[PDB]
Amino acid sequence: PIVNLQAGGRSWKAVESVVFQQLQTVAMQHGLVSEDFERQLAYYATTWTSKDILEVLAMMPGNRAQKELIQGKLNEEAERWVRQNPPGPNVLTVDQIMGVGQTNQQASQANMDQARQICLQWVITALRSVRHMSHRPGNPMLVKQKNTESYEDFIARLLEAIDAEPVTDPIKTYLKVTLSYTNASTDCQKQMDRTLGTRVQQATVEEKMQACRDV
Amino acid sequence: PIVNLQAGGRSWKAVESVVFQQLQTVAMQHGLVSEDFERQLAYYATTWTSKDILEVLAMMPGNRAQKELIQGKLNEEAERWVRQNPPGPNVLTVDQIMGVGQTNQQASQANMDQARQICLQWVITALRSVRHMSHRPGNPMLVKQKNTESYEDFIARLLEAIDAEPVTDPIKTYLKVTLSYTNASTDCQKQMDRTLGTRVQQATVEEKMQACRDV
Amino acid sequence: PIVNLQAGGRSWKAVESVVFQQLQTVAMQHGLVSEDFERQLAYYATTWTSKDILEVLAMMPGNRAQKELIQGKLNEEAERWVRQNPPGPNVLTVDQIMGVGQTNQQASQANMDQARQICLQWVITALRSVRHMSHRPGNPMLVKQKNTESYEDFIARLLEAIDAEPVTDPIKTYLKVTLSYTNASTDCQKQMDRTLGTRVQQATVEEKMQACRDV
Amino acid sequence: PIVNLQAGGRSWKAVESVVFQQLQTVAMQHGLVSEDFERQLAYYATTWTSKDILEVLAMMPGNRAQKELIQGKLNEEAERWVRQNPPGPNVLTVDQIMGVGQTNQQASQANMDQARQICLQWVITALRSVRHMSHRPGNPMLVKQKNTESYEDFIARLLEAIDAEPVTDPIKTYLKVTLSYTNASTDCQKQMDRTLGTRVQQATVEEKMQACRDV
Amino acid sequence: PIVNLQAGGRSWKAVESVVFQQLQTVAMQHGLVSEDFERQLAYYATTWTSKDILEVLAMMPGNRAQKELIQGKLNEEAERWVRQNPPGPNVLTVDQIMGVGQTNQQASQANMDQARQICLQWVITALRSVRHMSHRPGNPMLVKQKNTESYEDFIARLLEAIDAEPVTDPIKTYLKVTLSYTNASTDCQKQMDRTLGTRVQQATVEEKMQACRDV
Fold this sequence. Notes:
Chains A, B, C, D, E: It comes from Maedi visna virus (strain 1514) (MVV). Chain A is mainly α. Helices cover about 65% and strands about 5% of the residues of chain A. Chain A has a two-stranded antiparallel ribbon with strand order 1-2. In chain A, helix 8 packs antiparallel against helix 9. Chains in contact: A-B, A-E, B-C, C-D, D-E. Chains A and E meet through helix 1, helix 3 and helix 4 of A and helix 1, helix 2, helix 8 and helix 11 of E.
């Protein structure tokens, strides 16, 4: 965490243990790629020196398979940057954006504030990219209600997947309304046939979750 | 969290990690709509800038299905406000109450103290509205004791549901006394028939929980 | 938490999040009535303004059924106080002891220090009363070793119950020695017959736990 | 926790909530007697006023059966002290060592620094004594690998027990080498027969754990 | 944790409870040897006096079997040092590197800064050595997908093992590509045969995890 000194200097303070205990808890249960982890990182990532944004992503417990796909995506993002930006004095080298060469204090210095933004942007871009592919959220069309699961659950998984897929929001909407009836368990579908009637694939989630989860 | 400066200025300090770790733990187990989460938010929501009251509701892990119904309810509450309050210089625009346009420091400023109250009021109103409909608490009449569950459990679920339903407190009372015998497992009902006798549907929970959970 | 100002004033500081995370964790697993929660509250309840002692009891996650019986016991304790103390200027009204009328700062003021003590005394008295009746600890005579449970477990449940029952300590002692053999599983009883011999119902727990849990 | 004032005075600061959350978490899972709890207490017990060393041992959740055997052992240790030390002005009375009579500030005072050491010594002595007898660690000779458990597990339980038993370290060593083959599951024993050969009861744990846990 | 005084002196501050609660949580679930614990230790080990780096390794809950193999490896590393460095005034004795003789303040002093680095280097070297042998990560060739586990899981275990084995990174790469198809469950293998075709043992994990985990 970059610390702005009273003199206006920038100093490096280690990420407080409490912050990791929050990110890690979300990481192990919801998943490292999981939207939940991405939001958490962003809330606290504003003041994090590039070096930390990478180290903290590494200190996260478990999610080893994900930390593999991500590490690859980050490398690909770096390749795009080196290709997009030919080496130049103003241009920041991939290492500077990674911050690997710099010491913690050097990363905190004002010159690398642009670098921190780029590193966070790659990490967040990478986390999102892995999520649509790793399928910890999953592929929506495939997600279907387990007989044991409540329609509230099927919706939770379906909403995650419909959100994860990189598709325009209009289409997400259609997917939420149409897929909820199609992939749902037959018993909810039957109950929705009795209540929703034709609107079964035209109704909103609010109308539907009330229909099967209630009664 | 709005910070009152010694100069009397208002500054924005990020919600401390410890606060999230408490809200999140209650969120994942009891539920985001769950009365427990609502109380927690309120205890710490007094000093939260509108922007946070929304962001913190978003950083909460899981409860994706609920975060869908809520997001809709908040939008509906905004529609009521814009309809109730025609746009005016004194009137706060929905965005100002959401705080989306403002920077964190701007939200903390004294002018938007009214906005924070309205935003908290919508969030808390929305959480309560989703709870009666999502049925994480459930529909009381439907709640019934699982043979495995103790009468203490059936009461815990029944009390949650009887509280969640938006009905006058007198009626809640009648529901607590009458429903507890009706939806309870037969074995407790038989035991209560032997001890409570006629008052089975007239007795209080204290009398009843002593009857089946004890012996 | 009442804060004694350097000027000697009393100011209200919110219960720190860490304190709740401890009380809540004990609350959900051991139980709100559970002796464990009662001890925790007492350690930190010394500096808590009456309003908090009630609000914190309410912020506790789960234990909804218990929070019902308690709320009733607290009301009964208030009825005893109003009956015991006829209204008078010196007399503190039930509301003042509850602190419902006062603002947080008003509760912290020196005048209501007596009120905080009374409120804590009712809460702790109420928690103890609910425990003997709710039977989260249970009725000792009924507690018996599940075949799966170790004699160490049966003792843990039996000791909880023998302690919970409102009986003079001499009798508790007799119950601990006699009940441990009687309600224990036959296999431990047989093993104790072989080692303890006649003293089976005269031996201490130390002698007995060594007998079945060991070998 | 005794606080050394800048003036050199000693003041009493309550054990921070974070410390309990660590001790309690270790307590409920590993066990109150468990070596793990004993080490934790010692790390933080250096600055704890006798009163706390007892109160904190009491605030620990669960382990009710253990808190019974310990309470007895502490009483026995007190009996040894009163017998060993005839009452005298220099001699500290059992109550002073327990600190029950003193207020928190009085316990923190320099005069009772010797008392805190004695109280910690009894608590730690008591915890160790209960552990060899309670058998939460268990009796080594009895510990045997469950077919499901890995040889890594059997070693974890066997090492705990061989350590718990109050025997000279030389003998512990022999027990670790000999018992590991004898109480282990036959399948590991067969595999060790194939790899260790004669040294089966002469090999070290490092050699053995590599033999069955690996391959 | 060594504290640099404003005077430039070095003072010893106890490891904050929050740090242990993070290390312990990672320790009990992922494992003490687990790469996750090693990274955590390193992030916070920079300012830890040798005495702590050992004591903290000891305060870690559970992993008793591992704490045995490690304790042996640390002793072996010490033997290498005493053999590599003949005793000399400049040479640091094994005890000084362990810090057992020194008081906490003495360890924090500047003279033993070299010792702390050596102690951390042995601990980290020891943790890595135990990991390849204990097989909490396991032997890669042996790791195979359980029918229940997802190909995402098999990859998580396989990647851990391929990383743990002390082999040059080129070979790790070949192992990741070849082993993933070979040890995977037949159903994923069949699906990969249909999609990957010949590249089944030439494809990358990104290509493969998309193939079976998706669809």
